[PDB]
Write a protein that binds this ligand. Structure first.
Ligand SMILES: Nc1ncnc2c1ncn2[C@@H]1O[C@H](CSCC[C@H](N)C(=O)O)[C@@H](O)[C@H]1O
Ligand SMILES: Nc1ncnc2c1ncn2[C@@H]1O[C@H](CSCC[C@H](N)C(=O)O)[C@@H](O)[C@H]1O
Ligand SMILES: Nc1ncnc2c1ncn2[C@@H]1O[C@H](CSCC[C@H](N)C(=O)O)[C@@H](O)[C@H]1O
Ligand SMILES: Nc1ncnc2c1ncn2[C@@H]1O[C@H](CSCC[C@H](N)C(=O)O)[C@@H](O)[C@H]1O
Lengths: 9, 160, 160, 161, 9, 8, 161, 8
């Protein structure tokens, strides 16, 4: 499985 | 100086750090258990610009298409960075190997960088700024933000 | 069955689901312009229990204390769910990242879930009930209920 | 110094100006235990002082009752309608719509610190809240909603006090 | 149901 | 800058 | 039929006995135009078959970094260091020293016929090349070196292939 | 100018 990078808000 | 003057001077400096892309004060190093990473070669003070998360800016539907294609090849690596701008979801897809360093920065929940949105003439950019003073030699780290049960099972280092 | 019998049977189903914390028939997806959302992976029928809005149950003094702290950090999201119970203000504070899904459900004034207060032997719970049949693949949505000018100015998606 | 008539006239003009400007000083919104939002005094008010207008859509009774029958179909609406007599007719300030105006956020007590009164300006009625006693900085503003209906009290038991 | 806010003479 | 979730 | 357990234990037996013996049968060295030495299959291999270990000095990260900086001073050294992650740490099979082992001599292709796998025997990691498809006698053995970095591919353009 | 071999 792949993860991501994510900026919340 | 007025507030307007101080703001515009600040905006221009950040715009120019982004546009020039010099990426000073950093070097690639092999990091135990993490693959490659990026180490500071100078002090950064809390609040200082560190680096852009630079890559190919795409919208969410294309990002989802690329995810499914990348998932076909377990060797690809995860370099896609999702974010919101003006009521839409975008992604900086940094999969392609370039000379840019933001894409090589590793994950921590007790890191030393914070990602911020910075737009220029309606074009969004993701930038990393120091969240504390960083000493030369420290590894740059930020919170990848992926909390999904599935990601954590596959990538247990996301937990810390 | 009598109304009372049907009510007791519903209460029993709901109590069991609150106990188990089972959150079946849902998954997280990225929804354009909203961050994460929760989508149905099976059909739900009108009236079905969907999920508990699960987090830290606190009273008003602690809720205000936490608000003031959250307000100082722009990276912190909005997960505090206020309600009235026995003449007092309570709050389910779901700010901490957990695997529970109610906290991730987005807003609409014309959604498909309705929040209800459900009391178990003096302990209040906020639960989401399907307000209509919900299709597989569609996003779960309920009315956040904050209609304040101060909130809609900063979060215009609250208006719809 | 001045005559009573002069003093009353100058006082009325100050109140007219506060109504027209919509200036709402000396107040802040806070969460109040068991009541939702409410309004707290941030300065002292003396007995008889202007506190705030109950500001919203001024409408007639027939229109108000029609609006209310529609609101009643959505239990989430909330109750922001203020009915009153003016001369030989009945009107309503319908403050259902969320605005920055504070009068609509003030909570109920039968033993509060504000009293609502009619203040007309050139034949246009305004509902204003006046301090019914001196009010200390830090106090929640409260007035009597005036609803004695059994059905109202059953659904909103806080009306009892 | 609803309550009102009511002023009379 | 923050909104709430509020039972109505 | 053989049980899953028998199949797994028999699979490990084939692999671990070839690792331990290190005879590297069914392969030879030849000179491949523009690559230096390479390794040619002298027998068929079937999909999934163990081909050869990537055999050299197993070292941890601090020593690997030290060795890299030394090798970088001498262009004649060549690039034989194979990095991998194992139990949350970085290791390296450093095959820089000339030996008679063949894994270190196998050339790169993105679309080759071998895939490198991490393989644990009694808590010791090994890098092993497994046939990704049936391999015919006469084929050059080839696997993806995995270095996609811009600096590497611009200095060693054959990495793009 | 060195490359590596890296397990992916
Ligand atoms: N804290 C951590 N622990 C282990 N691996 C990490 C990590 N943070 C990032 N990574 C690795 O880095 C990937 C994100 S891209 C970051 C650059 C990467 N290390 C590289 O060499 O190309 C992750 O999918 C994972 O392979
Ligand atoms: N209708 C809507 N449009 C845009 N954003 C929404 C939305 N409903 C909810 N949100 C977002 O969701 C937040 C509430 S918490 C809901 C989960 C959130 N989307 C997340 O990924 O963590 C809001 O503050 C806002 O950021
Ligand atoms: N004394 C009291 N106790 C509990 N709730 C009260 C109250 N006085 C007013 N309220 C609440 O306030 C409503 C009238 S409008 C007043 C503002 C409201 N508290 C708000 O946050 O929007 C009432 O219907 C009830 O919900
Ligand atoms: N596809 C390819 N094209 C050209 N040279 C290659 C190649 N794959 C591997 N090499 C060469 O092999 C080196 C890795 S070690 C592989 C054995 C080496 N050919 C030798 O004779 O010792 C590379 O740095 C490069 O010099």
């Amino acid at each position: 499985k792949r993860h991501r990078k994510v900026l919340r808000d | 100086k007025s507030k307007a003057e101080l703001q515009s001077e600040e905006r221009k400096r950040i715009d120019e750090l982004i546009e020039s892309g010099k990426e000073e004060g950093m070097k690639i190093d092999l990091i135990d258990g993490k693959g490659r990473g990026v180490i500071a070669t100078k002090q950064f003070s809390r609040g200082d610009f560190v680096v852009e998360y630079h890559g190919d800016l795409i919208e969410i539907t294309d990002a989802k298409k690329r995810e499914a294609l990348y998932a076909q090849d377990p060797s690809t690596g995860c370099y896609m960075y999702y974010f919101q701008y003006l009521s839409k979801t975008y992604c900086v897809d940094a999969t392609r190997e370039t000379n840019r360093l933001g894409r090589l920065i590793n994950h921590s929940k007790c890191g030393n960088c914070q990602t911020k949105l910075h737009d220029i003439d309606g074009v969004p950019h993701l930038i990393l700024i120091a969240s504390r003073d960083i000493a030369a030699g420290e590894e740059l780290l930020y919170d990848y933000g992926d909390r999904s049960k599935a990601s954590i099972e596959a990538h247990p280092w996301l937990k810390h």
